[PDB]
Amino acid sequence: EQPIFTTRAHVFQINWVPASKQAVTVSYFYDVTRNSYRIISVDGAKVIINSTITPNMTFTKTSQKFGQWADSRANTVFGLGFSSELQLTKFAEKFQEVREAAR
């Protein structure tokens, strides 16, 4: 009933530009038809993150409250700003697992 993982943060895209007027919900979903996981975040009428996680993708913590990952398909880099190190830590953790399940 609940997503694999869900959190809240500020979204930025590639210098950085804000993608969300405020902190929004960001979640991991299992894309049934595609047989892969996707990170999805919406804000109003816009879906600001619709990223499929593949094995060769990597999430980097460029700080203990900020992290990022490159998305070739969408051709853009996404950055998330967290209000706490713990959230960032749990997000980066799920990212790794999800990537390992994509192997």
Q: Which two tokens stand for residue 81?
A: 């700003």
Burial of 102 (0-12, 13-18, 19+ CB in 10 A): middle
Domain containing 51 equals 1-103
SS (H, E, C) 32-90: CCCCEEEEEEEECCEEEEEEEECCCCCEEECCCCEEEEEECCCCEEEEEECCCHHHHHH
Q: Report residue 68: phi and psi, to 5°.
A: -150, 165
Contacts of 62 (CB under 8 A, 6+ apart): 68
- The experimental method behind these coordinates is X-ray
Amino acid letter, 10: H
Identify the CATH number of the domain in which residue 27 sits.
2.30.29.30
Indicate the number of domains in the chain.
Answer: 1
Structural resolution in Å: 2.2
